[PDB]
Write an enzyme that holds these catalytic residues in place. Structure first.
Site: not given
Ligand code: YDK
Length: 263
Positions: A13, A16-20, A36, A123
């Site tokens: 999805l 981040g800095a420490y992983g995906e 996360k 942030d």
């Molecule tokens: N709790 C979640 O559902 N997290 C999601 S859903 C999503 C998502 C959902 C649908 C389409 C595309 C992305 C991206 C992210 C996510 O956490 N991305 C981070 C990455 C680092 C910067 N902050 C955001």
């Protein structure tokens, strides 16, 4: 490992800095949860978990739990299927003013909530604001979050962590500062990006010409010239250099554009 037996890590999805961040879907129920993944041996992961435990609000990404497998931490979070706010912002254009107004109201509700419990996010930016399946805004990614108020006793902060075009000018000028005005400033930068599709400066320093232009009220230049007078007047109160003169959130809630019926 038994989790990945029953749950398909369908795809990445984000990074981040420490992983995906991975989308996990339960092969039987089809429930989706965001995972996360953070590598402790590489944001502060101990505090992130600890701050996530305190939160319960409709405009913050819900935290279900976590676990450690060796040096890797796994955080289990509500999946926000609407994705990042960042991807609702058309480069150089923004989005319609009513959409920007609705998102900003929801940003304010989430930020009031955090500050009410003495937490600052530090942030705030479109990449850290997710949308659910009804386009409700959810504040996300608490790896730089910290406590600024203990019961009813504030402390000043001193960390210059945060994404630089979103950072308040006191972080480059003062050795310590109040938490809340820093969050208010980044919210102003988010509003600017929503309305214009463009960040105004690399950094709010004297040496940055685009910052000097704004200080000199040159609102006939981009991004400001794309922004209607009403929302611009709110931005004039938020992107105020002296954090002691900067508008507070109770006063943002009195602003004319903030309360303006659109559409
Ligand atoms: N709790 C979640 O559902 N997290 C999601 S859903 C999503 C998502 C959902 C649908 C389409 C595309 C992305 C991206 C992210 C996510 O956490 N991305 C981070 C990455 C680092 C910067 N902050 C955001």
């Amino acid at each position: 490992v038994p989790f990945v037996e029953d749950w398909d890590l369908v795809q990445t999805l984000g990074e981040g800095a420490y992983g995906e961040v991975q989308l996990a879907v339960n092969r039987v129920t089809e429930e989706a949860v965001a995972v996360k993944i953070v590598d402790m041996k590489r944001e502060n992961i101990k505090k992130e978990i600890c701050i996530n435990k305190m939160l319960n609000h409709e405009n913050v990404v819900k935290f279900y739990g976590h676990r450690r497998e060796g040096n890797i931490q796994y955080l289990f979070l509500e999946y926000c299927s609407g994705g990042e706010l960042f991807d609702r912002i058309e480069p150089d254009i923004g989005m319609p003013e009513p959409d920007a107004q609705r998102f900003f109201h929801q940003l304010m509700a989430g930020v009031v909530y955090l500050h009410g419990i003495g937490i600052t996010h530090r942030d705030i930016k479109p990449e850290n604001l997710l949308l659910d399946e009804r386009d409700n805004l959810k504040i996300s990614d608490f790896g730089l979050a910290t406590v600024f108020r203990y019961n009813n006793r504030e402390r000043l902060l001193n960390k210059m962590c945060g994404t630089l075009p979103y950072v308040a000018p006191e972080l480059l000028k003062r050795r310590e500062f109040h938490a809340e005005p820093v969050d208010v400033w980044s919210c102003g930068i988010v509003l600017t990006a929503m309305l214009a599709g463009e960040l105004p400066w690399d950094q709010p320093s004297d040496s940055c010409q685009e910052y000097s232009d704004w200080k000199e009220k040159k609102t006939y230049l981009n991004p400001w010239k794309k922004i209607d007078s009403a929302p611009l007047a709110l931005l004039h109160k938020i992107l105020v250099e002296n954090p002691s003169a900067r508008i507070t959130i109770p006063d943002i809630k009195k602003d004319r554009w903030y309360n303006k019926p659109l559409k």
